[PDB]
């Protein structure tokens, strides 16, 4: 599992290294983009865009609007909060607990939703998207490791 | 990689967890023992035994003495510090010669515990006969990070 081991080391060094620099969500998004090989969006518990990075353009009006608003609409924020654990490979044909009216979030590509949890609290949501390649268990290991680090840093920014 | 994913979830929950209870190294050692399936020893940067858990007896008089003293001798503490990154599957055939009695029996993996960019201690793992693979290292290094998190938290208690 050597590639996975190397990739966990890159994420893990985020937890263990330095601890000096201020929090930078765009930088974290970029790191996870390259390690996981996926679009990365970091959303707060209240639906605010904290940071993102894209390596594969996907046509999605709902995500585009979120980017423009730097915020999900209230209903979408609520339905993300209602995802209690990692939900992967969501698409147009998905089988999930988003109301049909809000499944335009999965218009195109494949989406994985990973709750960000820190200090026993829901701190936000890590959303990953790819044009065509499925997320496998290795991808989920890295996504969940990344989510935990982002949670760590959301707390730091709270206390900054 | 379903078994690995489940095991990372158990370790990871330790990070994303409450943050209520005071730090407990014996508990962390017991968790890692079950998740990784290995003996677990948590040692501070100064060679003090912080916690440990055993699931397979290995006759090793050097390790037994450390457990009795709750501390490594100076020379061993120094040579653990000089281990800059994970070193796995150490045994009699693989530290100066005089201090390789640490690897008398079984297979040993040494994982530096790093937090705040600093060397906070060492996680030592041992097994009677089964080799540590990359999955084992992923879990060991995840566990090491959590323990480092807690050594810092304990420093600010």
Curated annotation (Swiss-Prot), chain B:
Changing residue 62 to E: Nearly complete loss of ilvB repressing activity in a BCAA-containing medium. Changing residue 62 to A: Retains some ilvB repressing activity in a BCAA-containing medium. Retains the ability to respond to GTP, but responds poorly to branched-chain amino acids unless GTP is simultaneously present. Its main location: cytoplasm. Activity of CodY is modulated by interaction with two types of effectors: the branched-chain amino acids (BCAAs) leucine, isoleucine and valine, which are signals of the nutritional status of the cell, and GTP, which may signal the energetic status of the cell. During growth in a nutrient-rich medium, the concentrations of these effectors are high, and CodY, once activated by binding to these effectors, shows an increased affinity for its target promoters. GTP and the BCAAs act additively to increase the affinity of CodY for DNA. DNA-binding global transcriptional regulator which is involved in the adaptive response to starvation and acts by directly or indirectly controlling the expression of numerous genes in response to nutrient availability. During rapid exponential growth, CodY is highly active and represses genes whose products allow adaptation to nutrient depletion. In B.subtilis, CodY targets include several hundred genes involved in many different processes, including sporulation, competence, transport systems and catabolic processes. CodY bound to GTP represses many stationary-phase and some early-sporulation genes during growth in excess nutrients. Among others, it binds to the ilvB promoter region and mediates regulation of the ilvB operon by GTP and branched-chain amino acids (BCAAs). It represses expression of the dipeptide transport operon (dpp) during the exponential growth phase in rich medium. Modular protein made up of an N-terminal effector binding GAF-type domain and a C-terminal wHTH DNA binding domain, separated by a helical linker. The GAF domain is involved in the formation of homodimers. Amino acid binding to the GAF domain is associated with drastic but localized changes in structure. Structural changes upon isoleucine binding may lead to increased affinity of Ile-bound CodY for its target DNA. Homodimer. Homotetramer. Homodimer under physiological conditions, but homotetramers are observed in the crystals. This is Global transcriptional regulator CodY. It comes from Bacillus subtilis (strain 168). The chain holds residues 2 to 160 of 259 of the full protein.
């Amino acid at each position: 599992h050597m590639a996975l081991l190397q990739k966990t080391r890159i994420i893990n060094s985020m937890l263990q290294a330095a601890a000096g620099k201020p929090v930078n969500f765009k930088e974290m998004a970029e790191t996870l983009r390259d390690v996981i090989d996926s679009n990365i969006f970091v959303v707060s518990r209240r639906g605010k865009l904290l940071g993102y990075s894209i390596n594969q353009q996907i046509e999605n009006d709902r995500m585009k609007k979120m980017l423009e608003d730097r915020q999900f609409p209230e209903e979408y924020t609520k339905n993300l909060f209602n995802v209690p654990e990692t939900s992967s490979n969501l698409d147009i044909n998905s089988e999930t607990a988003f109301p049909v009216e809000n499944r335009d979030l999965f218009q195109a590509g494949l989406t994985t939703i990973v709750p960000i949890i820190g200090g026993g609290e829901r701190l936000g949501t890590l959303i990953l998207s790819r044009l065509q390649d499925q997320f496998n268990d290795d991808d989920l290991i890295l996504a969940e490791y990344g989510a935990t680090v982002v949670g760590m840093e959301i707390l730091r920014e709270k206390a900054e």
